[PDB]
Specification:
Chain B: It comes from Homo sapiens (Human). This is part of a larger assembly, with two copies of chain A, one copy of chain B and one copy of chain D. By secondary structure, chain A is mainly β. Chain A contains one helix and eight strands. Chain A is globular and about 50 Å long. By secondary structure, chain D is α+β, with helices and mostly antiparallel strands. In chain D, a hairpin with a 2-residue loop joins β4 and β5 (68-74). The chains are: A mainly beta, B mainly beta, D alpha+beta. Chain B binds chain C through residues 17, 20-22, 24, 30, 33, 35-38, 43, 45-46, 106-108, 110, and chain C through 1-3, 54-59, 61, 84-85, 87, 90, 93-97, 99, 101. Bound molecules: a molecule of 3 linked components (NAG-NAG-BMA) (3 copies).
């Protein structure tokens, strides 16, 4: 949260390596004397974000959604693709051609992406995500003043 | 110093007492919480200086948050909620009157 | 799709903190049962079924704790925090009857005083 | 404002309880220049170092801070297999505080062919400073102009 301007800023940090790979057979921290590139970006989220979690799968072939709780009680899931560090400022040819959206620091809370339609949690202490067995199913249980699954 | 904020919300129809059930208002979100009256009014006390966004929370008909700026001298200035811009858009009177449009769309249509 | 599948494979259970100040008045007593807890939540249980009729959550970090609770024939009076803000609730319906701002003291005791016929004043005594 | 830092190295069979003075490091806070000056190793120390390398031991470095004690461990097997090449990095706060140091070797291998007495005569080290970096904020001013234009 920023004191200068009354707002909540959203910073996403990502680690990226170069074009050439290392041994890539056995990983160890004794070796690998390199410094990975760090990417940072900023967004605006008009909420408090009491709780926060990521959907975790067994194999990890589906998308990576971020579950965020609100003081209201509704839990909203948003895709990691929107909050990506590789967001060019000016629209360039190849970036728009492959898969990208122009960068804009405005995130709106859509009512359609509301898991909690009627059932709300008064106090969102935390949420637990458990990977199921099929491929693309995660069991989300929100605990606190009430229990909801 | 401490100040108090008053407000009054009106539903399109039905009954004020029916909508009063399970209805609260947030000033910051977890810091200051206000409760509604029998027909409708939120009155909040024990508030320090600063600017806060008042929003009425309800699983039923929702409301538009309103930004309120509080001065030490005692001037109250209400404006629309603006994040990209940080200027004065349009000025409205202090007697907060929120007008709920209706039920928010929770389910998609196929 | 969500409106079609309302409650097929989802469930919510609503819970309440430890009972601190509960009353078993209401001589008519249809289903009313008031409970105010130590987690700054005030709820109403049902004698017959047991579900929640109306429940209110204000605070829970360090303030808003309930100190004392009085019960009239139809209305409930309670004091939150430590003697700064007081609000009265109803039981037929649920919401606020009235609110009062107290002074800067240490909440010790409260009572009902009745002039000649019935109670019209509540006495609140602080440290000084 | 020039301050000296004490740099000790460790050398044992499998444990580590002996520390000896290796050299002096000069650090000037206002400029940001870091200089090293260490003495040369004796023949007995070189032989002990070679014996430790074949025993895949550990190379602990102690740097007292004015108190605190910072230690860093580095495999010496790669140091002996390759040429002597250590890289030192100091970590500081926004003010005159010391977090710690890390020793990093560019080769970082495990082949282990052979070491010649000509190789281990001079010490090849480089000292660097890594002050905290300020993250960027929301670039909304450019977005507003892009929307207007
Ligand atoms: C990438 O990392 C892997 C795993 O650390 C390296 O493979 C391993 O390399 C070591 C060293 O060459 C092998 O050790 C060998 O042990 C035998 C006795 O068992 C000894 O006679 C040899 O002289 C050697 O020391 C180890 O077996 C080997 N492991 C496997 C599974 O192959 C690999 O060399 C690394 N590659 C690069 C490019 O760094
Ligand atoms: C949020 O929950 C409330 C309940 O507290 C929902 O209102 C009730 O919704 C149920 C269905 O979800 C309605 O039941 C219906 O009853 C008719 C017969 O009256 C039956 O033919 C239908 O098949 C269905 O079972 C119930 O009438 C309704 N009650 C009221 C007073 O409206 C509310 O719809 C929920 N919000 C949603 C779904 O967005
Ligand atoms: C003593 O330390 C200095 C500096 O650390 C060493 O100079 C460095 O030497 C290496 C190879 O000997 C150079 O690596 C080269 O990198 C370029 C790309 O930058 C690559 O194209 C070459 O094929 C090669 O890999 C390095 O640039 C150079 N300078 C540094 C690291 O700042 C010096 O070799 C050391 N002396 C001994 C005897 O080890």
């Amino acid at each position: 949260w920023n004191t200068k301007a009354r707002r909540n800023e959203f910073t996403v940090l990502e680690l990226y390596e170069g074009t050439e790979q290392y041994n890539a057979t056995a990983f160890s921290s004794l070796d690998r004397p390199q410094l990975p590139q760090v990417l940072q970006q900023s967004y605006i989220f008009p909420s408090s974000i009491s709780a926060m979690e990521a959907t975790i799968t067994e194999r990890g072939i589906t998308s990576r959604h971020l579950l965020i709780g609100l003081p209201s009680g509704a839990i909203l899931s948003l895709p990691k693709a929107l909050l990506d560090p590789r967001r060019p400022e000016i629209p360039t040819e190849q970036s728009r051609e492959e898969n990208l959206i122009p960068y804009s620091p405005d995130v709106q809370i859509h009512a359609e992406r509301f898991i909690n339609y009627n059932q709300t949690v008064s106090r969102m202490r935390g949420i637990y995500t458990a990977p199921s067995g099929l491929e693309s199913t995660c069991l989300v249980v929100a605990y606190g003043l009430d229990i909801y699954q | 110093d401490r100040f108090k904020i008053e407000g009054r919300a009106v539903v399109p129809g039905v009954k004020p007492q029916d909508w009063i059930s399970a209805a609260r208002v947030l000033v910051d979100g977890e810091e200051h919480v206000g409760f509604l009256k029998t027909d409708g009014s939120f009155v909040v006390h024990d508030i320090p200086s600063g600017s806060y966004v008042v929003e009425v929370v309800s699983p039923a008909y929702r409301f538009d948050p309103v930004r309120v700026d509080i001065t030490s001298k005692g001037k109250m200035r209400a404006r629309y909620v603006n994040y990209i811009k940080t200027s004065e858009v349009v000025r409205l009177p202090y007697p907060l009157q929120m007008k709920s449009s209706g039920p928010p769309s929770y389910f998609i249509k196929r | 799709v969500y409106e079609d599948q309302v409650g097929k494979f989802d469930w919510r259970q609503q819970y309440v903190g430890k009972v601190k100040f509960a009353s078993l008045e209401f001589s008519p007593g249809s289903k009313k049962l008031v409970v105010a807890t130590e987690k700054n939540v005030i709820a109403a249980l049902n004698s017959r079924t047991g579900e929640i009729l109306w429940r209110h959550v204000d605070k829970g970090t360090a303030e808003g704790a309930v100190d004392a609770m009085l019960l009239h024939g139809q209305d409930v009076i309670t004091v939150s925090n430590g003697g700064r803000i007081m609000r009265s609730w109803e039981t037929n319906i649920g919401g606020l009857n009235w609110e009062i701002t107290l002074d800067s003291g240490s909440f010790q005791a409260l009572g009902l005083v009745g002039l000649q016929e019935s109670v019209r004043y509540i006495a609140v005594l602080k440290k000084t | 404002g020039t301050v000296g830092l004490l740099l000790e190295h460790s050398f044992e069979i499998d444990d580590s309880a002996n520390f000896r003075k290796r050299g002096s490091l000069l650090w000037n806070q206002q400029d940001g220049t870091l200089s090293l000056s260490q003495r040369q190793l004796s023949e007995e120390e070189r032989g002990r170092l070679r014996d430790v390398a074949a025993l895949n031991g550990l190379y602990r470095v102690r740097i007292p801070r004015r108190g605190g004690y910072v230690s860093s461990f580095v495999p010496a097997c790669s140091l002996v297999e390759s040429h002597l090449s250590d890289q030192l990095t100091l970590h500081v706060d926004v003010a005159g505080n010391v977090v710690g140091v890390s020793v990093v070797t560019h080769p970082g291998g495990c082949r282990g062919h052979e070491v010649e007495d000509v190789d281990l005569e001079l010490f090849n080290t480089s000292v660097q400073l890594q002050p905290p970096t300020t993250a960027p904020g929301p670039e909304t001013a450019a977005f507003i102009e892009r929307l207007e234009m």
